Amino acid sequence: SGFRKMAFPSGKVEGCMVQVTCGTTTLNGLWLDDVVYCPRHVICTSEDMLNPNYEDLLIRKSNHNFLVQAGNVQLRVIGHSMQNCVLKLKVDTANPKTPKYKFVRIQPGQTFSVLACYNGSPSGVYQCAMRPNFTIKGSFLNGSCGSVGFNIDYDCVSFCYMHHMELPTGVHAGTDLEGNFYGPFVDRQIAQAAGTDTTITVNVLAWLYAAVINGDRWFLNRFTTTLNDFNLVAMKYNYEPLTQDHVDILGPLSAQTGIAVLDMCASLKELLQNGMNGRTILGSALLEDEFTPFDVVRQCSG
Amino acid sequence: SGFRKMAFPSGKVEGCMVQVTCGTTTLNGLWLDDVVYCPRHVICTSEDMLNPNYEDLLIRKSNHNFLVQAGNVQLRVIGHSMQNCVLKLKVDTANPKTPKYKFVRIQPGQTFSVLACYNGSPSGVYQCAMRPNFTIKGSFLNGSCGSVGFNIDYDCVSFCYMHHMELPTGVHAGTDLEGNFYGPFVDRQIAQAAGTDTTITVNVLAWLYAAVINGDRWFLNRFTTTLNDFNLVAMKYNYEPLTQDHVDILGPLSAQTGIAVLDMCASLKELLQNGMNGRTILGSALLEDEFTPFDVVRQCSG
Structure with a gap:
């Protein structure tokens, strides 16, 4: 007996975390098969985030401008594509630790586990809910962007969340793994109304x-x-x-x-x-x- | 920003969890190098737990009476030894997923992550504290015995807890990885006073x-x-x-x-x-x- 706020075992996701560096910015990426998924704002400077033109910023980048490191293993980027607010970096090696997985867009009020990571390295795991207003109340410091949320069903990892932003109010916003934000939020450093939340x-x-x-x-x-x-x-x-x-x-x-x-x-x-x-x-x-x-x-x- | 009750990433421990079966009893074991660690009461029936003579019960067991399965891989038990309240099963294969690890006895008031497991399979991970009275307030159903608690420092897993018992009061008791209970508790199905707890x-x-x-x-x-x-x-x-x-x-x-x-x-x-x-x-x-x-x-x- 006993009841605890319990996260899913994180090992299958740990094997997928990588470091992505573009110019001066380093955040976390998710390496599944031969694709690395990460927030598109990896291509931004601190000043770009005020009003970024992501299409223009990405055009100035080539495959060799993205450095992807899985622990000590450096990956070779052979294609890049922006899908909504995520970057998809095609690499020449399929991740041998790729679990069975799906991408899912969860509904508000559902729960998931977050593997908080920095520099591609996992630091901790916790369980949380998607608020009715499509924020999450997480624990995310600088460099945690690209950390992912997920559920596990038997041997299949359903990825549902990638972390992108801390709002000025201290709550957190991000996307599904197709790069579509949950809620009204955008990947720009402006004040953003979250709107009334309710209890589930x-x-x-x-x-x-x-x-x-x-x-x-x-x-x-x-x-x-x-x-x-x-x-x-x-x-x-x-x-x-x-x-x-x-x-x-x-x-x-x-x-x-x-x-x-x-x-x-x-x-x-x-x-x-x-x-x-x-x-x-x-x-x-x-x-x-x-x-x-x-x-x-x-x-x-x- | 934000503050969450955060568990350590569990992957390094997941790779060590195995199923141990002795007669009719199945619980979890910890496979490190060529040794599997598990609660000694795996050798007990439900009726043995009222007043078990562990020495007498173990004498009736041979190496081949212990079935150890790491997922689909069956392990061959080639020695067995009781150390305090843990059984140490020598197997013929070193676990290739053995992390760098230590065994530590933690102090009351310290915290650790628990990987709750059933039938050798991880189900979830949560963070908790060792109470001043050497109980823990966990989430442990039937078959979770042998689930372990741990901290991680860089690449080293410090194992500090193995789950053995639910007290009639619904709190949880167990041992360090040398088999010594935290607190006054014994591995016997009797009422056991935990004594006054305090806030840390x-x-x-x-x-x-x-x-x-x-x-x-x-x-x-x-x-x-x-x-x-x-x-x-x-x-x-x-x-x-x-x-x-x-x-x-x-x-x-x-x-x-x-x-x-x-x-x-x-x-x-x-x-x-x-x-x-x-x-x-x-x-x-x-x-x-x-x-x-x-x-x-x-x-x-x-």
């Missing part, structure tokens, strides 16, 4: 189920509610509206615990209206929304 | 420094205190007494932020006496004590 209600509910399974049950009450009644509370407290699709995804957890989804909603309603009264749930003094229903089942079923 | 004060202070570095500063006050005055508060709130050794280890963080350690103690004193007033620090509504000063510097310096 279906994830909070999943975590409440995780809590019941592990013996934290004090928040279970004698009340029930309706979807529409609960959603009135959700709107007041800036929670995502709960849909039947969310109720359906919570089905297995409701079955395992014998607690109907709408009963759990009435517990959550009381928690929102009355707070936690100085108590904790699974070691937290706030309502946690970075575990999906799939995360809870995964961790509880091994 | 030097870690809370480190995390407050992490918070200041990242812009959370509301808890900084106009007061200061003394070591002895603060320790009077620490004792009232079941915090570890702060020593000069702790103050010294916080030195670099004090220098970086310009906040004297005893000034930070006065902030923490006010937080203990008055609570957090419905505010949060680094996204937490409680005082976090699972980051060491070294953890904070690591994450803040990349």
Whole structure:
């Protein structure tokens, strides 16, 4: 038993991390088969980032201007192509450590593991959620650009995130592996509105189920509610509206615990209206929304 | 910027995980050079665990009774030896994925990453602290025994923990890699007192420094205190007494932020006496004590 915010094992991604240098800028790249993927702003100086013309900047670069190093192994760049906000560097060697992989664009509220890297070298791994407003609340210092987010299903790595930017507000923005930003953000050093975020209600509910399974049950009450009644509370407290699709995804957890989804909603309603009264749930003094229903089942079923 | 509970990259440990089966019991082993390390209670049935005579139970086992599988590769066991609470199975093949490694016995209050595994297969990685009472608050289901805890320094893996037991209270106990339990615990299915735990004060202070570095500063006050005055508060709130050794280890963080350690103690004193007033620090509504000063510097310096 016990419930932890758990990242996927990072080894399959570690074998794909490389260092990419273009002129004076060095960040991280992802080496899969004979292609290295990295943020296109590797071609920018610090001053270019105010208003870069990426097409013009890239035209001044040739294959030999990109230095790619996988640990001690230097790779030979034989083609380059910009796809949205990512650069794809064709190299002459297929990465022998390429795992089975897919590129996926995840939905807001889903979770993934981030392998934070600097100079092509992994430093740590953590689990986080894509916020409803398409930011992530990560840990990214200078040089972490090109670090990637991913999920693992058996032997297949689904890459979903590449880190590009820290907003002036301190939250993080990036792209899928086709180079399309999540959210409204652009790869330019300007102030950028993220817009109102909300709490991921279906994830909070999943975590409440995780809590019941592990013996934290004090928040279970004698009340029930309706979807529409609960959603009135959700709107007041800036929670995502709960849909039947969310109720359906919570089905297995409701079955395992014998607690109907709408009963759990009435517990959550009381928690929102009355707070936690100085108590904790699974070691937290706030309502946690970075575990999906799939995360809870995964961790509880091994 | 940003601050996350970050695990070490797990790949070097993933390459060492194997499945160990003895009779009906299957758990995880650690394959380093030509030795596989695992909990000795792999030789027990469910009923043996009430009061096992490990010496007598092991005498009934020969090398061929231990089945060791590294993924699809079956290993040949050519010797076996019990060292305290671990079994050491000599195999005929050196693990070609053996990282540079050491075995270390960590001190209470230090942190490490756990690679949770089932049937020899990694499922996730998380960071935790050794509690002052030598338990850990982990995520360990049936079959996770033999999962290991570790730190990484450059290219060297320092293994510090092997998981053995879930106490009836739901917390976790295990050994160093020489098989010596942390704490008073034994590998027997009986009720076992863990004893009073306390909060790791030097870690809370480190995390407050992490918070200041990242812009959370509301808890900084106009007061200061003394070591002895603060320790009077620490004792009232079941915090570890702060020593000069702790103050010294916080030195670099004090220098970086310009906040004297005893000034930070006065902030923490006010937080203990008055609570957090419905505010949060680094996204937490409680005082976090699972980051060491070294953890904070690591994450803040990349």
